[PDB]
Design a protein around this ligand. Sequence first.
Ligand SMILES: [Br-]
Ligand SMILES: [Br-]
Ligand SMILES: [Br-]
Ligand SMILES: [Br-]
Ligand SMILES: [Br-]
Ligand SMILES: [Br-]
Ligand SMILES: [Fe+3]
Ligand SMILES: [Fe+3]
Length: 213
Amino acid sequence: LLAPIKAFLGCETPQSWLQFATQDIETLLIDHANCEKKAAATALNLLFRYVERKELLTNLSQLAREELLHFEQVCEYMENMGIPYKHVPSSRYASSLRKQVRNEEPYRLVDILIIGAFIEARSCERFAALAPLLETQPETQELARYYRFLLKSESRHFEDYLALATQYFPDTEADLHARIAEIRECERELIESEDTEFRFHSGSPAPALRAGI
Ligand SMILES: [Br-]
Ligand SMILES: [Br-]
Ligand SMILES: [Br-]
Ligand SMILES: [Br-]
Ligand SMILES: [Br-]
Ligand SMILES: [Br-]
Ligand SMILES: [Fe+3]
Ligand SMILES: [Fe+3]
């Protein structure tokens, strides 16, 4: 299941991220909640703009409902875990990737769908990496269960985004691969490079941030 996710991504989640993540479950979960909202937002914006693309309408409308359901599920975990819904401003991740999107159609559309694929792939890999680590303490065992449950969901979302990108790309398969490889390098750098904040999709925690715990 994770084999094609790992092939598609340009790196694994660094061990530095995973070590920090277990020391700030609160930020992890609130940012997770926000990411689920953002994935619904992305899909819905696409439903507004590309009404001629009929497989995108069917698939992404379903996806946006599932993401909203994920949102409600995380909100319930927060309730149950005693976690208030604090203001956590968004990661650098999605906004940086969104800066790569080309203006010219249909490359705009294709880039957005390729980024979707990478975001969903990365989430899937990161949930997978976290789940066994969270399993090790009782107060995070329920979250681990939930993270393993999400894996199937995210894997499908990745596949769907990538399938859409493939069918609406106008040029050769080789041209698609080369563009995917460009976005892969951007995403890899966002994940592996140092990051002074901690979020679901934040990069390798900086010393500054390590000192704070
Ligand atoms: Br859009
Ligand atoms: Br629903
Ligand atoms: Br024990
Ligand atoms: Br291209
Ligand atoms: Br880097
Ligand atoms: Br932080
Ligand atoms: Fe989700
Ligand atoms: Fe998703």
